[model samples]
Target: DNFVIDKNDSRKIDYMGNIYSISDTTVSDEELGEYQDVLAEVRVFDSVSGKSIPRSEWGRIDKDGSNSKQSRTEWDYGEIHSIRGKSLTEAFAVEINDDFKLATKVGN
Candidate 1:
């Protein structure tokens, strides 16, 4: 975990005032839409089933600082950890997990 802002959006800092370290730095919903089924999409995950039972799940990637998609910088994104804040489109730029395996030709 280092300190970084993105290259495209470097419009936002750290607390280390010593040798001088360096740093760097959307979409609408309703109106625009694209709907198509994909044959190229790989279906399903290789989930371990039937040890007991399995069910569909809901996972919400919530942000901090109150309100939906609120602005905060307590987590790590990119190679850098956290900065100040980001605007609308850059909101979902936080880092994700390694277990998110989804490809066109992947899974069960």
Candidate 2:
């Protein structure tokens, strides 16, 4: 874990076994400042019995670190997010948030 990744870890790897080490780590400044303060989030898929247990990870936007997130039902909206088409994706919600926070039961 000394400023590097494990070749065996599929979390950073694509289908062909090439590790996709996030943005900057993969390739420095490919889209830097293309969109300000937007960090990415991820979770590991750990399960065999339908329970995708994940050890989470966080990135830095403090190259700026801002979130212009807003409410819905008042108006349609969206942005950089982990929308769990199923609960596996939602599982990470217990470990992360927006700029960050949440007040819903949809994840339960």
Candidate 3:
């Protein structure tokens, strides 16, 4: 097999099929437009339960990257929860839903 990598397979693409080249450099504020680092928060929905998950019960705060925390409560329903962080700048990526909403960020 050829050792060459596939550019189409290597780059990141948005929903509109715009491909972005990967960069090792950290993202700058100018790249983020008017977005600024702030305490990141999120709210999610669960279809089966037909309701928002209780914030008091399932909430989590992931710091840096390590978490061994446990909860006594067990849930079988489709789960939705929040992630609160000190800053959004540290986030390298974010997950969005179908409507293009910010579901979660990668960093804290």
Candidate 4:
């Protein structure tokens, strides 16, 4: 493989066909510290059967990332996350953490 996304294979997460790319490259120390520029909260979504899948079994928080420390419970809203899933072409990648109180992040 060329290890490059060909023009035809890339698609935007939005309704329009947009192209994007992500490197399997390493993060620099300066880039990691740029977290200050990131949003305080996040909402995560994934597709299970041609549609968005629930993040949690209950409540408003989407499914916790694989690294999350809490068990599935009502109190999960207080949990901290480093990242969550977002689609990149046919694959999924971490989309950054959702920092706001999840109660404020819910929507269709």
Candidate 5:
């Protein structure tokens, strides 16, 4: 996999170019707190349960380096596939799949 370093938090990379910490980039509590319910509205459904799960329930999206972290590059935000020492966020950008989906609604 192409592992990269997040430009915003490149400081997290050490002198030897190794990531000692999970990742420095994270969603601010203020942002997450303010949109807590809005975030919850973004959902994914389970095929078998006949029920839906909020993005929060599917995975840890706000925590530092939680696999759900997104990138502005060609990467969208999903899984950990490439290991090219790229930013953790880019490396784990989501990929298209049958069971999981990510989205943001426009307008109120």
Candidate 6:
């Protein structure tokens, strides 16, 4: 992984480029917020426990740069494998054994 600098956030890329922050882009926090519960569940990896652990809400979804919710998730799990980083949500990994199970819902 590398630093990415992109004027457009919707565009997908192989190289890391500074993409437009979610607030800078058309995606609004309100729009992304509702997805939070779903997102956190996504990262929970299904086999973890009983009630799905909540998505981390330690940062703001709007605005750019550090402290933004998305940025925090990136910084937190930027280098970890088996971790799913999507929509600025928390991530986790389960041991590759009898403890892992796939989920029926993948989140939006």
Candidate 1 structure, TM-score to reference:
0.12
TM-score of 5: 0.16
Question: Higher TM-score: candidate 1 or 4?
Answer: 4
Candidate 6 TM-score to native: 0.13
Model 2: worst 10 consecutive residues (lDDT sum): 70-79
What's the lDDT for candidate 4? 0.25
Model 3 CA deviation exceeding 4 Å by range: 1-11, 35-108
User: By summed lDDT, which 10 consecutive residues of candidate 6 come out lowest?
Assistant: 36-45
Clashes of each: 4, 1, 0, 8, 19, 6
Q: In candidate 4, where is summed lDDT lowest over 10 consecutive residues?
A: 99-108
- What lDDT would candidate 3 get against the real structure? 0.27
Local lDDT at 20 for model 6: 20
Candidate 1: residue 74 Cα off by (Å): 2.6
Residue 98 miss distance in model 4 (angstroms): 9.6
lDDT of 6 by residue, 63-83 (tens): 554532222222111221222
**Which sections of candidate 5 miss by over 4 Å?**
1-42, 60-108
Could you tell me the lDDT of residue 38 within candidate 3?
24
Residue 7's lDDT within candidate 1 is: 25
Model 1: CA > 4 A from native: 1-4, 7-70, 78-94, 97-108
State the lDDT at 45 in candidate 4. Answer: 27
Could you tell me the TM-score of candidate 2?
Answer: 0.17
Better of 2 and 4 by TM-score: 4
lDDT of 2 by residue, 1-108 (tens): 111122333223221222222211111232221221223333333222212222331222134433233111111111222223322122111112222222122211
The lDDT values for all models are 0.21, 0.23, 0.27, 0.25, 0.28, 0.23
C-alpha RMSD values across all candidates: 18.9, 18.9, 16.4, 13.9, 18.2, 17.0
Model 3 TM-score relative to the real fold: 0.20
lDDT of 2: 0.23
